[PDB]
């Protein structure tokens, strides 16, 4: 019912040289409360806050989180922004000021109508021991690693209810 390999590959062009050193730099999610999100992404998931930008006239902040050594963060503001925004695989969290106070407000995780965005995913060396730690930290699960057909694979949720896949690259081969 899907594409054959031939049909999919036929729609794939070789990369034009004008796209050399293009990189997938960021995924942007809106967060209700940056205090809860920064705590979750740093303390639970082990990411580093590499850059914060505030736009007072437009009333929002941007928070860039990445799996980066905090010692590699430049100290010069100009160099720091250029370094942060040239890292692969960053998470950009957008804070619209006031949402944290608004009892009525929440963001949509794209896993109920209307769907689109599904999840971010973290590759971990040990899914079961990562999930044991998540459980002990009181993390909310969508899919415990032992539930359903796909054993050794988990989904958790962040403070806004965004889904985070927890996967082990070797266990994914075997699940085929």
Q: Kindly tell me which of 43 and 152 has the beta carbon lying closer to Zn ion.
A: 152
Query: Is residue 115 a known part of a binding site?
Result: yes
Q: What are 135-143's contacts with CB under 8 Å, separation 24+? A: 137/43, 137/44, 139/44
- Check if 136 is active-site: no
Binding residue count for its own copies, defined by CB under 8 A: 94
Residue 8 in contact with Zn ion, rule: CB under 5 A: no
Q: How would you class 150 by CB atoms within 10 Å of its CB: exposed for 0-12, middle for 13-18, buried for 19 or more? A: middle
Query: Which residues lie below 8 Å from residue 102, measured CB to CB, with a gap of 6+?
Result: none
In angstroms, give the least distance from the CB of 111 to Zn ion.
Answer: 12
From candidates 75, 103, 146, 162, binder to its own copies by CB under 8 A: 162
Query: Of residues 96-155, which lie at the interface with its own copies (CB under 8 A)?
Result: 97-98, 107-110, 114-125, 129-130, 133
The structure tokens 């109920």 sit at 112
Cite the active site residues.
165
């Amino acid at each position: 019912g899907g594409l054959t390999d031939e049909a999919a590959l036929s729609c794939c062009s070789d990369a034009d040289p004008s796209t050399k050193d293009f990189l997938l730099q960021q995924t942007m999610l809106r967060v209700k409360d940056p205090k809860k999100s920064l705590d979750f992404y740093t303390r639970v998931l082990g990411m580093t806050l590499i850059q914060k930008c505030d736009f007072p006239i437009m009333k929002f902040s941007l928070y860039f989180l990445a799996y980066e050594d905090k010692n590699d963060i430049p100290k010069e503001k100009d160099e720091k922004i250029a370094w942060a925004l040239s890292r692969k695989a960053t998470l950009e969290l957008t804070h619209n000021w006031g949402t944290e106070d608004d009892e009525t407000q929440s963001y949509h995780n794209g896993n109920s109508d209307p769907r689109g965005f599904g999840h971010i995913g973290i590759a971990v060396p040990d899914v079961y021991s990562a999930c044991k730690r998540f459980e002990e930290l009181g993390v909310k699960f969508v899919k415990k690693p032992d539930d359903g057909k796909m054993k050794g694979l988990a989904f958790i949720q962040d403070p806004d209810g965004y889904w985070i896949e927890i996967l082990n690259p070797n266990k994914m081969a075997t699940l085929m």
